[PDB]
């Protein structure tokens, strides 16, 4: 039932201008978005963007992915992001993370038919 947009948008969208929370931004949002369900997602990157925004890099920068796959786009702007990486000191279940907010071009994987991001490749 999950589909692959869907998936990208509970692991990456966080429309708002940074980053916002009560406590350590990524121990809290991994936490609530179910990345440390069943591992700790080791890196991860949330985007404060508008989905559209978001969504329009699909027709921007075409680049390789990282896997070697042509199906990758990059911004043509900045955008607002945070980036999550497991501590050390992280163990599943008790996965801990440092926050890295920064302004980046990031670089998306597009498929589908609507063509939309359904996974997020690097930040440049
Ligand atoms: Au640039």
Do not use: W
């Amino acid at each position: 039932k999950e589909t692959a947009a869907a998936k990208f948008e509970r692991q990456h969208m966080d429309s708002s201008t940074s980053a916002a929370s009560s406590s350590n931004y990524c121990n809290q949002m991994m936490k609530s978005r179910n990345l440390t369900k069943d591992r700790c997602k080791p890196v991860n990157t949330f985007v404060h963007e508008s989905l559209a925004d978001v969504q329009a890099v699909c027709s921007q920068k075409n680049v390789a992915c990282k896997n070697g796959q042509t199906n990758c786009y990059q911004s043509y702007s900045t955008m607002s992001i945070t980036d999550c990486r497991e501590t050390g000191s992280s163990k599943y279940p008790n996965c801990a993370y440092k926050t890295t907010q920064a302004n980046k071009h990031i670089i998306v994987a597009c498929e589908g038919n609507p063509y939309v991001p359904v996974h997020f490749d690097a930040s440049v």
